[PDB]
Amino acid sequence: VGTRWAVLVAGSNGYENYRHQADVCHAYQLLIKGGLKEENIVVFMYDDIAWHELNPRPGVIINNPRGEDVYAGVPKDYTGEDVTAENLFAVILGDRSKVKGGSGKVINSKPEDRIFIFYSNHGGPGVLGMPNEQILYAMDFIDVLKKKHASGGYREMVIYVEACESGSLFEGIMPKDLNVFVTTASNAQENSWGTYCPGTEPSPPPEYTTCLGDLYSVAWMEDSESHNLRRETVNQQYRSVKERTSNFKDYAMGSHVMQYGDTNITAEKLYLFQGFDPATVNEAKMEVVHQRDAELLFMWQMYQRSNHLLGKKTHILKQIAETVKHRNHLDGSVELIGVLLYGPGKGSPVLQSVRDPGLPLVDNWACLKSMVRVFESHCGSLTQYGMKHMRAFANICNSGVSESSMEEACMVACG
Amino acid sequence: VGTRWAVLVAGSNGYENYRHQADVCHAYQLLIKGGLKEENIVVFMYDDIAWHELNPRPGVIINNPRGEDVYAGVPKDYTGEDVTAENLFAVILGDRSKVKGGSGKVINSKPEDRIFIFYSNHGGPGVLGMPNEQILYAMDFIDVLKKKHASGGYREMVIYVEACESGSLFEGIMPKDLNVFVTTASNAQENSWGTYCPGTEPSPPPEYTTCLGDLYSVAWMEDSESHNLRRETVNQQYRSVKERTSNFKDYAMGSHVMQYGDTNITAEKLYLFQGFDPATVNEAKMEVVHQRDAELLFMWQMYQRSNHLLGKKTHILKQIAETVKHRNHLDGSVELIGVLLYGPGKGSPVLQSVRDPGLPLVDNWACLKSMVRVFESHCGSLTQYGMKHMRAFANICNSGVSESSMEEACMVACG
């Protein structure tokens, strides 16, 4: 009894981030094969990958080396400028009146229905990326779940999140009484991983200069599509994905998959959320690339493939230098703010200290947004890479440092 | 039979580096108390500390919290602009014709004589600082020892070096057949430490905003002045200094004292090199500060002591920001050069790889100087802090990367 809904979100754009949209398109195809209806699956994807000038298979997206297209048939619900945090919240709430642009499809669910949410891109401590120069903050995502729960618009929900430090979106803040179960690609202090990368094994087709997928994402999808979901439980998928994402417990090239929320949902059969493919009647180490370094890997691939063209080669090398200089500006400015506020030798211990598991990243989420606002007003936009510094901003909030002191430090560091 | 000579060198200047000149002045006083004659001890010190506007005891320098002046009576052999690598080499060779400025005092020693060399400041892999915008390279220092040995101008020599990564000045290149024994404050991959720092224990007098000494340096000096050097061997001093510099084998706040050269000299009584004080008839953990961060600690002390003066406080905070921005420029530019030459993900492993103990830092020392020259021509002067990147430059040389490729990478990184 009830209807199965899904919300699939890629939080990034650019050919360098092909894998996030490939993960989301693969999830869409898997859910349709399971019997979920298109009207109940909302897709958020920037939609700049299939027809990108750099795509060697125009109009096609693949998510693993087998090369099966996952782009054909995916709906354009929220693409381009409409991939926003506000539209994501309106969609989850089932409030078409709060949607701006897009198809108008929302999760206008009933109390008997189940919902599956999958996000891929990206992130930082307490934050997720959204592609139109937006940061999605953890407490706002939890508040949307609380609002949806208070309306009575679903029976249970399962949420899968692929992003760096993704455990920090739920630690200390995700309630267990919302009928929502969550898993994350990593704990609160680990990065997440791209996989099926050029120059690595398992290798994507040779024409690819960008990674095809993300480790935790392809782990759950390849697990669902290789099992009878009427028999596999939510717990069994969690255990399998945790094992695969750990990469033979080698955490220098793997992460700790975490679980939050209502763990009673782990006893449920996965088909209640992902459907079941009627045609299904029921492992080696993977080379991975840090999510934050996959863009530089892609630019280096473009550089190495243009070695015969001097002009193009020089242009790409200068783009790599601009990208590293921008990364260095953000990393150096945040380190400098720590020194100005706390002194040398205490700056890094304060900004980089990780709270114990189970504690929220920040006590005041409005303060966290204000630290980002003050930083950006003097130092420039944070960018997706800059989300790595969200624990530094949270730690400034937690330390008792004033917003007036942050303003002074940012002005000295970046004016 | 024979005369005891010494060469004492501080490689730095500025009130932030008070400790290097305080170590050298203390060494001078200790040697005079031992019966070495002033005409046989050459002092290299910039000489900007005793009368510095920031010195709370004008005309006085102290090297430990007991506060005994060590400045009065120290000769001005090579000070200011004359503290150069060329003068140091001429002095060690005993060649007054090759000295420029200074007092003209040199080590014009005889075959029966012994020599003691002590250097304090900082350094980097394969390099030592000199204060007039100069880097002293390890192979040139070894070549001066070989030239002095070839002339027959001494019986034995002992050399003590306090600087970061100082073991790298001798690993793989110091011969055992020159009648020279050497110890260093650290191994080839560790920093060295300032001690007697403000805000730490054992604490210097409260008027001091800069560290009074360096750990290995005060370890040997305080050991020599508390023992009968006619009974203590060179080996006993090495063992005591190794124990103290390790700081209870806590290498997060200590270093590994290393030995090189002719270890047969360790059996000799220390008075043969340092003299003996006729009035001498024969341990707790020390708080330390990284040599490369002591300047920022001093600037933070000045900032915290000027909190009542808004104008002065703001000025110091901007000086701290300029210093950290300069550090970030050097660190970021070297990291960017690694990415441009080797690609992302291989850049840091190549630039930061440490050769096995016993191997020279670089196979071609002229290439090492050329990498520094190319870097500086595009990215600016390395500065003393920038000597930390000498292993990256050595690794560029060792990798087979051409000087033409280094030029291209530096131009892209810094133009």
mmCIF file with all atom_site columns, C-alpha atoms in Angstrom, chain A residues 24-205:
data_model
loop_
_atom_site.group_PDB
_atom_site.id
_atom_site.type_symbol
_atom_site.label_atom_id
_atom_site.label_alt_id
_atom_site.label_comp_id
_atom_site.label_asym_id
_atom_site.label_entity_id
_atom_site.label_seq_id
_atom_site.pdbx_PDB_ins_code
_atom_site.Cartn_x
_atom_site.Cartn_y
_atom_site.Cartn_z
_atom_site.occupancy
_atom_site.B_iso_or_equiv
_atom_site.pdbx_formal_charge
_atom_site.auth_seq_id
_atom_site.auth_comp_id
_atom_site.auth_asym_id
_atom_site.auth_atom_id
_atom_site.pdbx_PDB_model_num
ATOM 1   C CA . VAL A 1 24  ? 22.253 10.455 -10.571 1.00 0.00 ? 24  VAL A CA 1
ATOM 2   C CA . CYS A 1 25  ? 21.295 9.321  -14.089 1.00 0.00 ? 25  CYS A CA 1
ATOM 3   C CA . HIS A 1 26  ? 22.255 5.729  -13.189 1.00 0.00 ? 26  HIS A CA 1
ATOM 4   C CA . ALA A 1 27  ? 20.082 5.965  -10.033 1.00 0.00 ? 27  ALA A CA 1
ATOM 5   C CA . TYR A 1 28  ? 17.174 7.182  -12.163 1.00 0.00 ? 28  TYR A CA 1
ATOM 6   C CA . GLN A 1 29  ? 17.485 4.214  -14.561 1.00 0.00 ? 29  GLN A CA 1
ATOM 7   C CA . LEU A 1 30  ? 17.740 1.749  -11.675 1.00 0.00 ? 30  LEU A CA 1
ATOM 8   C CA . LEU A 1 31  ? 14.574 3.119  -9.997  1.00 0.00 ? 31  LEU A CA 1
ATOM 9   C CA . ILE A 1 32  ? 12.573 3.005  -13.279 1.00 0.00 ? 32  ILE A CA 1
ATOM 10  C CA . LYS A 1 33  ? 13.677 -0.640 -13.770 1.00 0.00 ? 33  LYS A CA 1
ATOM 11  C CA . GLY A 1 34  ? 12.353 -1.227 -10.220 1.00 0.00 ? 34  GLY A CA 1
ATOM 12  C CA . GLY A 1 35  ? 8.880  0.040  -11.095 1.00 0.00 ? 35  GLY A CA 1
ATOM 13  C CA . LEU A 1 36  ? 9.010  3.538  -9.634  1.00 0.00 ? 36  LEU A CA 1
ATOM 14  C CA . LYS A 1 37  ? 7.106  5.869  -11.932 1.00 0.00 ? 37  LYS A CA 1
ATOM 15  C CA . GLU A 1 38  ? 8.679  8.882  -13.580 1.00 0.00 ? 38  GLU A CA 1
ATOM 16  C CA . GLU A 1 39  ? 6.010  11.183 -12.111 1.00 0.00 ? 39  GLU A CA 1
ATOM 17  C CA . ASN A 1 40  ? 7.245  10.207 -8.628  1.00 0.00 ? 40  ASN A CA 1
ATOM 18  C CA . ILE A 1 41  ? 11.018 10.668 -9.249  1.00 0.00 ? 41  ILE A CA 1
ATOM 19  C CA . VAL A 1 42  ? 12.337 14.253 -9.237  1.00 0.00 ? 42  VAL A CA 1
ATOM 20  C CA . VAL A 1 43  ? 15.714 14.751 -10.898 1.00 0.00 ? 43  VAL A CA 1
ATOM 21  C CA . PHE A 1 44  ? 18.021 17.652 -10.061 1.00 0.00 ? 44  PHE A CA 1
ATOM 22  C CA . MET A 1 45  ? 20.944 17.764 -12.520 1.00 0.00 ? 45  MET A CA 1
ATOM 23  C CA . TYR A 1 46  ? 22.658 20.809 -14.060 1.00 0.00 ? 46  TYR A CA 1
ATOM 24  C CA . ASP A 1 47  ? 22.443 18.950 -17.430 1.00 0.00 ? 47  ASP A CA 1
ATOM 25  C CA . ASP A 1 48  ? 25.689 20.259 -18.936 1.00 0.00 ? 48  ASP A CA 1
ATOM 26  C CA . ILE A 1 49  ? 27.354 16.845 -19.385 1.00 0.00 ? 49  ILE A CA 1
ATOM 27  C CA . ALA A 1 50  ? 25.585 14.842 -22.110 1.00 0.00 ? 50  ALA A CA 1
ATOM 28  C CA . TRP A 1 51  ? 26.142 17.484 -24.814 1.00 0.00 ? 51  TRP A CA 1
ATOM 29  C CA . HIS A 1 52  ? 29.354 18.971 -23.428 1.00 0.00 ? 52  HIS A CA 1
ATOM 30  C CA . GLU A 1 53  ? 31.938 19.786 -26.123 1.00 0.00 ? 53  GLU A CA 1
ATOM 31  C CA . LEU A 1 54  ? 34.397 17.533 -24.214 1.00 0.00 ? 54  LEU A CA 1
ATOM 32  C CA . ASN A 1 55  ? 32.108 14.484 -24.079 1.00 0.00 ? 55  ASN A CA 1
ATOM 33  C CA . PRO A 1 56  ? 33.540 11.825 -26.458 1.00 0.00 ? 56  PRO A CA 1
ATOM 34  C CA . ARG A 1 57  ? 30.075 10.121 -26.671 1.00 0.00 ? 57  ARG A CA 1
ATOM 35  C CA . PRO A 1 58  ? 27.734 13.042 -27.402 1.00 0.00 ? 58  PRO A CA 1
ATOM 36  C CA . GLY A 1 59  ? 24.303 12.669 -25.878 1.00 0.00 ? 59  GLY A CA 1
ATOM 37  C CA . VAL A 1 60  ? 25.419 9.743  -23.737 1.00 0.00 ? 60  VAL A CA 1
ATOM 38  C CA . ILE A 1 61  ? 26.464 9.426  -20.075 1.00 0.00 ? 61  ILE A CA 1
ATOM 39  C CA . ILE A 1 62  ? 27.962 6.247  -18.604 1.00 0.00 ? 62  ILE A CA 1
ATOM 40  C CA . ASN A 1 63  ? 28.580 5.402  -14.905 1.00 0.00 ? 63  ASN A CA 1
ATOM 41  C CA . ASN A 1 64  ? 30.978 2.443  -15.132 1.00 0.00 ? 64  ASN A CA 1
ATOM 42  C CA . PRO A 1 65  ? 33.427 0.866  -17.655 1.00 0.00 ? 65  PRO A CA 1
ATOM 43  C CA . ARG A 1 66  ? 30.712 -1.397 -19.136 1.00 0.00 ? 66  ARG A CA 1
ATOM 44  C CA . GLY A 1 67  ? 29.577 1.746  -21.007 1.00 0.00 ? 67  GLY A CA 1
ATOM 45  C CA . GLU A 1 68  ? 25.793 1.468  -20.841 1.00 0.00 ? 68  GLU A CA 1
ATOM 46  C CA . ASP A 1 69  ? 24.100 4.852  -21.463 1.00 0.00 ? 69  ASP A CA 1
ATOM 47  C CA . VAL A 1 70  ? 22.141 6.159  -18.460 1.00 0.00 ? 70  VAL A CA 1
ATOM 48  C CA . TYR A 1 71  ? 21.155 9.592  -19.910 1.00 0.00 ? 71  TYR A CA 1
ATOM 49  C CA . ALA A 1 72  ? 18.385 8.701  -22.362 1.00 0.00 ? 72  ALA A CA 1
ATOM 50  C CA . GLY A 1 73  ? 14.969 9.120  -20.798 1.00 0.00 ? 73  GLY A CA 1
ATOM 51  C CA . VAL A 1 74  ? 16.049 11.041 -17.680 1.00 0.00 ? 74  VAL A CA 1
ATOM 52  C CA . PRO A 1 75  ? 13.565 13.865 -17.043 1.00 0.00 ? 75  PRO A CA 1
ATOM 53  C CA . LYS A 1 76  ? 14.530 17.511 -16.963 1.00 0.00 ? 76  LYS A CA 1
ATOM 54  C CA . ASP A 1 77  ? 12.821 18.463 -13.721 1.00 0.00 ? 77  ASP A CA 1
ATOM 55  C CA . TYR A 1 78  ? 15.314 20.929 -12.230 1.00 0.00 ? 78  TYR A CA 1
ATOM 56  C CA . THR A 1 79  ? 18.260 21.687 -14.484 1.00 0.00 ? 79  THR A CA 1
ATOM 57  C CA . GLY A 1 80  ? 20.664 24.598 -15.017 1.00 0.00 ? 80  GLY A CA 1
ATOM 58  C CA . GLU A 1 81  ? 19.733 27.649 -12.982 1.00 0.00 ? 81  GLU A CA 1
ATOM 59  C CA . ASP A 1 82  ? 16.890 25.717 -11.317 1.00 0.00 ? 82  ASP A CA 1
ATOM 60  C CA . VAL A 1 83  ? 19.201 23.349 -9.398  1.00 0.00 ? 83  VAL A CA 1
ATOM 61  C CA . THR A 1 84  ? 18.876 25.337 -6.201  1.00 0.00 ? 84  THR A CA 1
ATOM 62  C CA . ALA A 1 85  ? 18.586 24.628 -2.481  1.00 0.00 ? 85  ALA A CA 1
ATOM 63  C CA . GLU A 1 86  ? 15.226 26.465 -2.442  1.00 0.00 ? 86  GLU A CA 1
ATOM 64  C CA . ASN A 1 87  ? 13.845 24.196 -5.202  1.00 0.00 ? 87  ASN A CA 1
ATOM 65  C CA . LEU A 1 88  ? 15.199 21.102 -3.432  1.00 0.00 ? 88  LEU A CA 1
ATOM 66  C CA . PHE A 1 89  ? 13.423 22.118 -0.234  1.00 0.00 ? 89  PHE A CA 1
ATOM 67  C CA . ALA A 1 90  ? 10.168 22.939 -2.055  1.00 0.00 ? 90  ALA A CA 1
ATOM 68  C CA . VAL A 1 91  ? 10.326 19.606 -3.896  1.00 0.00 ? 91  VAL A CA 1
ATOM 69  C CA . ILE A 1 92  ? 10.868 17.586 -0.686  1.00 0.00 ? 92  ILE A CA 1
ATOM 70  C CA . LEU A 1 93  ? 8.008  19.474 1.014   1.00 0.00 ? 93  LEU A CA 1
ATOM 71  C CA . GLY A 1 94  ? 5.657  18.777 -1.896  1.00 0.00 ? 94  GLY A CA 1
ATOM 72  C CA . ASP A 1 95  ? 4.949  22.499 -2.257  1.00 0.00 ? 95  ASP A CA 1
ATOM 73  C CA . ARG A 1 96  ? 4.625  23.441 -5.947  1.00 0.00 ? 96  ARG A CA 1
ATOM 74  C CA . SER A 1 97  ? 3.751  27.024 -4.906  1.00 0.00 ? 97  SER A CA 1
ATOM 75  C CA . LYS A 1 98  ? 7.359  27.403 -3.549  1.00 0.00 ? 98  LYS A CA 1
ATOM 76  C CA . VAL A 1 99  ? 9.088  26.063 -6.674  1.00 0.00 ? 99  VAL A CA 1
ATOM 77  C CA . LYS A 1 100 ? 10.729 28.528 -9.070  1.00 0.00 ? 100 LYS A CA 1
ATOM 78  C CA . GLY A 1 101 ? 11.043 27.264 -12.654 1.00 0.00 ? 101 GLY A CA 1
ATOM 79  C CA . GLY A 1 102 ? 11.708 23.649 -13.510 1.00 0.00 ? 102 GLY A CA 1
ATOM 80  C CA . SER A 1 103 ? 8.986  21.144 -14.357 1.00 0.00 ? 103 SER A CA 1
ATOM 81  C CA . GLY A 1 104 ? 6.931  21.779 -11.216 1.00 0.00 ? 104 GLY A CA 1
ATOM 82  C CA . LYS A 1 105 ? 7.237  18.108 -10.180 1.00 0.00 ? 105 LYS A CA 1
ATOM 83  C CA . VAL A 1 106 ? 7.347  17.843 -6.359  1.00 0.00 ? 106 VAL A CA 1
ATOM 84  C CA . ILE A 1 107 ? 7.047  15.106 -3.682  1.00 0.00 ? 107 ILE A CA 1
ATOM 85  C CA . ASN A 1 108 ? 3.311  15.617 -3.050  1.00 0.00 ? 108 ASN A CA 1
ATOM 86  C CA . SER A 1 109 ? 3.264  12.399 -1.096  1.00 0.00 ? 109 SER A CA 1
ATOM 87  C CA . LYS A 1 110 ? 0.684  10.725 1.167   1.00 0.00 ? 110 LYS A CA 1
ATOM 88  C CA . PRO A 1 111 ? 1.116  9.203  4.668   1.00 0.00 ? 111 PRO A CA 1
ATOM 89  C CA . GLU A 1 112 ? 1.405  5.651  3.294   1.00 0.00 ? 112 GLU A CA 1
ATOM 90  C CA . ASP A 1 113 ? 4.167  6.547  0.806   1.00 0.00 ? 113 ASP A CA 1
ATOM 91  C CA . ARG A 1 114 ? 7.898  5.963  0.980   1.00 0.00 ? 114 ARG A CA 1
ATOM 92  C CA . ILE A 1 115 ? 10.614 8.306  -0.230  1.00 0.00 ? 115 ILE A CA 1
ATOM 93  C CA . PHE A 1 116 ? 14.220 7.660  -1.352  1.00 0.00 ? 116 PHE A CA 1
ATOM 94  C CA . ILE A 1 117 ? 16.664 10.590 -1.587  1.00 0.00 ? 117 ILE A CA 1
ATOM 95  C CA . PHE A 1 118 ? 20.111 10.280 -3.206  1.00 0.00 ? 118 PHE A CA 1
ATOM 96  C CA . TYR A 1 119 ? 22.565 13.159 -3.404  1.00 0.00 ? 119 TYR A CA 1
ATOM 97  C CA . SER A 1 120 ? 25.959 13.041 -5.164  1.00 0.00 ? 120 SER A CA 1
ATOM 98  C CA . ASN A 1 121 ? 28.697 15.739 -5.328  1.00 0.00 ? 121 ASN A CA 1
ATOM 99  C CA . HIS A 1 122 ? 30.872 17.983 -3.380  1.00 0.00 ? 122 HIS A CA 1
ATOM 100 C CA . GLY A 1 123 ? 30.614 18.846 0.290   1.00 0.00 ? 123 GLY A CA 1
ATOM 101 C CA . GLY A 1 124 ? 32.369 19.913 3.402   1.00 0.00 ? 124 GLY A CA 1
ATOM 102 C CA . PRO A 1 125 ? 31.785 19.761 7.167   1.00 0.00 ? 125 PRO A CA 1
ATOM 103 C CA . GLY A 1 126 ? 28.059 20.482 7.721   1.00 0.00 ? 126 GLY A CA 1
ATOM 104 C CA . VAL A 1 127 ? 27.511 21.475 4.048   1.00 0.00 ? 127 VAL A CA 1
ATOM 105 C CA . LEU A 1 128 ? 26.622 20.198 0.580   1.00 0.00 ? 128 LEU A CA 1
ATOM 106 C CA . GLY A 1 129 ? 27.285 21.814 -2.740  1.00 0.00 ? 129 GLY A CA 1
ATOM 107 C CA . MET A 1 130 ? 24.630 23.156 -5.076  1.00 0.00 ? 130 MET A CA 1
ATOM 108 C CA . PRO A 1 131 ? 25.819 24.270 -8.548  1.00 0.00 ? 131 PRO A CA 1
ATOM 109 C CA . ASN A 1 132 ? 24.590 27.858 -8.815  1.00 0.00 ? 132 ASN A CA 1
ATOM 110 C CA . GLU A 1 133 ? 27.050 29.347 -6.315  1.00 0.00 ? 133 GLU A CA 1
ATOM 111 C CA . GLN A 1 134 ? 25.114 28.032 -3.328  1.00 0.00 ? 134 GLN A CA 1
ATOM 112 C CA . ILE A 1 135 ? 25.936 26.143 -0.197  1.00 0.00 ? 135 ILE A CA 1
ATOM 113 C CA . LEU A 1 136 ? 23.282 23.881 1.347   1.00 0.00 ? 136 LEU A CA 1
ATOM 114 C CA . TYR A 1 137 ? 23.636 23.811 5.170   1.00 0.00 ? 137 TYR A CA 1
ATOM 115 C CA . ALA A 1 138 ? 22.956 20.644 7.148   1.00 0.00 ? 138 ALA A CA 1
ATOM 116 C CA . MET A 1 139 ? 20.543 22.168 9.671   1.00 0.00 ? 139 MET A CA 1
ATOM 117 C CA . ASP A 1 140 ? 18.354 23.535 6.873   1.00 0.00 ? 140 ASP A CA 1
ATOM 118 C CA . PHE A 1 141 ? 18.167 20.043 5.319   1.00 0.00 ? 141 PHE A CA 1
ATOM 119 C CA . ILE A 1 142 ? 17.230 18.549 8.754   1.00 0.00 ? 142 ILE A CA 1
ATOM 120 C CA . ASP A 1 143 ? 14.598 21.287 9.203   1.00 0.00 ? 143 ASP A CA 1
ATOM 121 C CA . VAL A 1 144 ? 13.034 20.344 5.836   1.00 0.00 ? 144 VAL A CA 1
ATOM 122 C CA . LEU A 1 145 ? 12.827 16.711 7.001   1.00 0.00 ? 145 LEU A CA 1
ATOM 123 C CA . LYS A 1 146 ? 11.213 17.859 10.275  1.00 0.00 ? 146 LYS A CA 1
ATOM 124 C CA . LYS A 1 147 ? 8.712  20.010 8.354   1.00 0.00 ? 147 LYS A CA 1
ATOM 125 C CA . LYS A 1 148 ? 7.852  17.129 6.013   1.00 0.00 ? 148 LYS A CA 1
ATOM 126 C CA . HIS A 1 149 ? 7.450  14.761 9.012   1.00 0.00 ? 149 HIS A CA 1
ATOM 127 C CA . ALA A 1 150 ? 5.213  17.290 10.822  1.00 0.00 ? 150 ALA A CA 1
ATOM 128 C CA . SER A 1 151 ? 2.882  17.399 7.776   1.00 0.00 ? 151 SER A CA 1
ATOM 129 C CA . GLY A 1 152 ? 2.464  13.579 7.872   1.00 0.00 ? 152 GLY A CA 1
ATOM 130 C CA . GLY A 1 153 ? 3.387  13.252 4.188   1.00 0.00 ? 153 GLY A CA 1
ATOM 131 C CA . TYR A 1 154 ? 5.234  9.898  4.266   1.00 0.00 ? 154 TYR A CA 1
ATOM 132 C CA . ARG A 1 155 ? 5.568  6.606  6.138   1.00 0.00 ? 155 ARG A CA 1
ATOM 133 C CA . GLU A 1 156 ? 9.377  6.131  5.913   1.00 0.00 ? 156 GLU A CA 1
ATOM 134 C CA . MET A 1 157 ? 12.314 7.630  4.065   1.00 0.00 ? 157 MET A CA 1
ATOM 135 C CA . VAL A 1 158 ? 15.844 6.448  3.182   1.00 0.00 ? 158 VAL A CA 1
ATOM 136 C CA . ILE A 1 159 ? 18.537 9.022  2.264   1.00 0.00 ? 159 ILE A CA 1
ATOM 137 C CA . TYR A 1 160 ? 21.951 8.240  0.698   1.00 0.00 ? 160 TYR A CA 1
ATOM 138 C CA . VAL A 1 161 ? 24.558 11.042 0.585   1.00 0.00 ? 161 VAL A CA 1
ATOM 139 C CA . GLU A 1 162 ? 27.791 10.997 -1.407  1.00 0.00 ? 162 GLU A CA 1
ATOM 140 C CA . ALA A 1 163 ? 29.986 14.025 -0.420  1.00 0.00 ? 163 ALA A CA 1
ATOM 141 C CA . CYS A 1 164 ? 33.137 14.837 1.582   1.00 0.00 ? 164 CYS A CA 1
ATOM 142 C CA . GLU A 1 165 ? 32.761 14.776 5.383   1.00 0.00 ? 165 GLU A CA 1
ATOM 143 C CA . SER A 1 166 ? 29.125 13.809 4.776   1.00 0.00 ? 166 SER A CA 1
ATOM 144 C CA . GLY A 1 167 ? 28.694 12.214 8.234   1.00 0.00 ? 167 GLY A CA 1
ATOM 145 C CA . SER A 1 168 ? 28.921 15.797 9.582   1.00 0.00 ? 168 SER A CA 1
ATOM 146 C CA . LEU A 1 169 ? 25.576 16.640 7.940   1.00 0.00 ? 169 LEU A CA 1
ATOM 147 C CA . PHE A 1 170 ? 23.822 14.376 10.468  1.00 0.00 ? 170 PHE A CA 1
ATOM 148 C CA . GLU A 1 171 ? 26.069 13.909 13.529  1.00 0.00 ? 171 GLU A CA 1
ATOM 149 C CA . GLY A 1 172 ? 24.499 15.503 16.600  1.00 0.00 ? 172 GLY A CA 1
ATOM 150 C CA . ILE A 1 173 ? 21.531 16.908 14.655  1.00 0.00 ? 173 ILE A CA 1
ATOM 151 C CA . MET A 1 174 ? 19.620 14.111 12.897  1.00 0.00 ? 174 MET A CA 1
ATOM 152 C CA . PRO A 1 175 ? 16.690 12.966 15.059  1.00 0.00 ? 175 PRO A CA 1
ATOM 153 C CA . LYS A 1 176 ? 15.753 9.297  15.257  1.00 0.00 ? 176 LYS A CA 1
ATOM 154 C CA . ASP A 1 177 ? 11.979 10.038 15.452  1.00 0.00 ? 177 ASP A CA 1
ATOM 155 C CA . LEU A 1 178 ? 11.274 11.183 11.868  1.00 0.00 ? 178 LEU A CA 1
ATOM 156 C CA . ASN A 1 179 ? 10.947 7.716  10.248  1.00 0.00 ? 179 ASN A CA 1
ATOM 157 C CA . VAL A 1 180 ? 14.082 8.622  8.235   1.00 0.00 ? 180 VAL A CA 1
ATOM 158 C CA . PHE A 1 181 ? 17.167 6.418  7.879   1.00 0.00 ? 181 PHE A CA 1
ATOM 159 C CA . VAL A 1 182 ? 20.358 7.892  6.416   1.00 0.00 ? 182 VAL A CA 1
ATOM 160 C CA . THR A 1 183 ? 23.687 6.634  5.194   1.00 0.00 ? 183 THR A CA 1
ATOM 161 C CA . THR A 1 184 ? 26.700 8.749  4.187   1.00 0.00 ? 184 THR A CA 1
ATOM 162 C CA . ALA A 1 185 ? 29.758 7.994  2.039   1.00 0.00 ? 185 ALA A CA 1
ATOM 163 C CA . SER A 1 186 ? 32.128 9.144  4.754   1.00 0.00 ? 186 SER A CA 1
ATOM 164 C CA . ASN A 1 187 ? 32.388 10.030 8.423   1.00 0.00 ? 187 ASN A CA 1
ATOM 165 C CA . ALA A 1 188 ? 32.578 13.683 9.648   1.00 0.00 ? 188 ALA A CA 1
ATOM 166 C CA . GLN A 1 189 ? 36.361 13.914 9.148   1.00 0.00 ? 189 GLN A CA 1
ATOM 167 C CA . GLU A 1 190 ? 37.087 12.038 5.907   1.00 0.00 ? 190 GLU A CA 1
ATOM 168 C CA . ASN A 1 191 ? 36.894 12.989 2.250   1.00 0.00 ? 191 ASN A CA 1
ATOM 169 C CA . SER A 1 192 ? 34.806 11.023 -0.295  1.00 0.00 ? 192 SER A CA 1
ATOM 170 C CA . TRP A 1 193 ? 36.138 9.363  -3.484  1.00 0.00 ? 193 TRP A CA 1
ATOM 171 C CA . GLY A 1 194 ? 35.723 9.425  -7.217  1.00 0.00 ? 194 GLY A CA 1
ATOM 172 C CA . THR A 1 195 ? 36.315 6.095  -9.014  1.00 0.00 ? 195 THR A CA 1
ATOM 173 C CA . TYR A 1 196 ? 36.456 4.633  -12.609 1.00 0.00 ? 196 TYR A CA 1
ATOM 174 C CA . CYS A 1 197 ? 39.070 7.379  -13.231 1.00 0.00 ? 197 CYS A CA 1
ATOM 175 C CA . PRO A 1 198 ? 41.364 7.705  -16.245 1.00 0.00 ? 198 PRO A CA 1
ATOM 176 C CA . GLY A 1 199 ? 44.832 6.366  -15.615 1.00 0.00 ? 199 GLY A CA 1
ATOM 177 C CA . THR A 1 200 ? 43.549 4.079  -12.813 1.00 0.00 ? 200 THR A CA 1
ATOM 178 C CA . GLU A 1 201 ? 42.143 0.481  -12.475 1.00 0.00 ? 201 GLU A CA 1
ATOM 179 C CA . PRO A 1 202 ? 39.296 -0.392 -12.974 1.00 0.00 ? 202 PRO A CA 1
ATOM 180 C CA . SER A 1 203 ? 39.788 1.844  -15.999 1.00 0.00 ? 203 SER A CA 1
ATOM 181 C CA . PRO A 1 204 ? 37.063 3.725  -17.867 1.00 0.00 ? 204 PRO A CA 1
ATOM 182 C CA . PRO A 1 205 ? 37.072 3.646  -21.752 1.00 0.00 ? 205 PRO A CA 1
#
